[PDB]
């Protein structure tokens, strides 16, 4: 429904060097959720997104990896239910892989509302199992919602453009899937995009998932069809 | 003097799918240079090789094309003078063209030593000019060294087996030709092999080149000499 590029255009990106950390603070009680956008200047991204509530509480945390931050925009809407919440972005890659970070308060008409509107009836994934969501070349981004009935959430989202060709991996953890649902948009440029949702918790910790098509462009451009010509110089 | 097959047999090749990217890290200062070997299972090769030093500095990059990766092994030696470096091997081909990649530290008595040992006094190519290096059928591989006096190196290397029959194209860039020379071993199976070196820098940007036969078979095997009986089936 909404292009993640537009949101990044009207933002103020902040540079986070490899091995460094930045924090955003949100004390206004009207901030229901925040949206984190992570981009790079072409190189792979390796980040850690954590929600800190008290002195030693981390109810929400992610381990992110993107092969090309310039092409693909990372996105996750994080709930900020109670009290002051500080979001922490930690670039865990080496000095060669800087990233840009935008985390700002969400809105009632923001990404979360669109993700909920596009969502389809969720399906159950048992602990230690996984689900696969093939998407057709017409889809540019997909909305992902992960929920539980009250148990802690331990999942791993993988975007594949091939048999074992991982383009984006998100190892997420939430203390309560019912109270703290996981929202995220995965951009799917190209063709052969397959979303694998892996429930890494033991068998007695099922979760609910719903991966729908979010942004479809309807390109269908076939100018490249024909003889393949190498670089001309 | 040395066969690329001998080294590639004592290595651990890594598959890079079309559109993917693998990276290596060499933080050890004892690593003076790394040799990069790329192959395929008979299908064409199309890869980008880059050296990453800082957050946004790529002082050594290479755009590579090989018509057949099984017959022809791409080889290059990349200098890593200062600090930690990571080599980025990007497969820019389509899904149909996977490549196998080896990048391991070079040694004192490795390829750079051999390429230097076989090298002959270098000649100059003016900016915007080109040079041609024909070779006789007995030579299987040739060693190429490119240098400048300190200015960035912008050169294109081409291998032809006919008038306009490109078999291997390497468009290389370097930030400092004196500090960062280009080393490479280009395989020349068969006959009619001509190595072309084009200086792509502006007219006032000369470079130094040396193209010498590295391995000569001398086997004198001429089994095909005689009746070319069509496939007997």
TrEMBL record, chains A, B:
Organism: Thalassiosira pseudonana
Coverage span on the entire protein: 69 to 294 of 294
Keywords of this entry: Signal
Name of the protein this chain belongs to: Uncharacterized protein
Keyword Signal: yes
Record keyword Signal present: yes
């Amino acid at each position: 429904x909404x292009x993640x590029x537009x949101x990044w255009d009207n933002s103020s990106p902040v540079i986070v060097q490899g091995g460094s950390l930045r924090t955003w603070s949100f004390a206004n009680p009207a901030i229901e959720s925040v949206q984190v956008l992570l981009k790079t200047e072409g190189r792979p991204l390796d980040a850690d997104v954590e929600l800190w509530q008290g002195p030693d509480n981390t109810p929400h945390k992610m381990r992110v990896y993107v092969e090309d931050g310039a092409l693909r925009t990372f996105n996750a809407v994080i709930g900020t239910p109670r009290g002051p919440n500080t979001v922490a972005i930690r670039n865990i890659g080496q000095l060669e892989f800087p990233l840009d970070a935008v985390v700002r308060p969400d809105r009632d008409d923001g990404l979360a509302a669109g993700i909920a509107s596009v969502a389809t009836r969720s399906e159950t994934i048992q602990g230690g199992a996984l689900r696969t969501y093939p998407f057709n070349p017409t889809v540019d981004s997909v909305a992902i919602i992960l929920k539980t009935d009250g148990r802690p959430l331990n999942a791993r989202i993988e975007l594949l453009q091939g048999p074992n060709n991982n383009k984006q991996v998100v190892e997420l953890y939430t203390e309560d899937g019912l109270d703290r649902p996981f929202f995220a948009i995965v951009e799917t440029p190209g063709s052969g995009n397959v979303v694998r949702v892996v429930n890494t918790a033991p068998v007695e910790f099922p979760l609910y998932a719903s991966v729908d098509a979010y942004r479809v462009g309807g390109g269908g451009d076939w100018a490249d069809d024909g003889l393949m010509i190498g670089r001309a110089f």
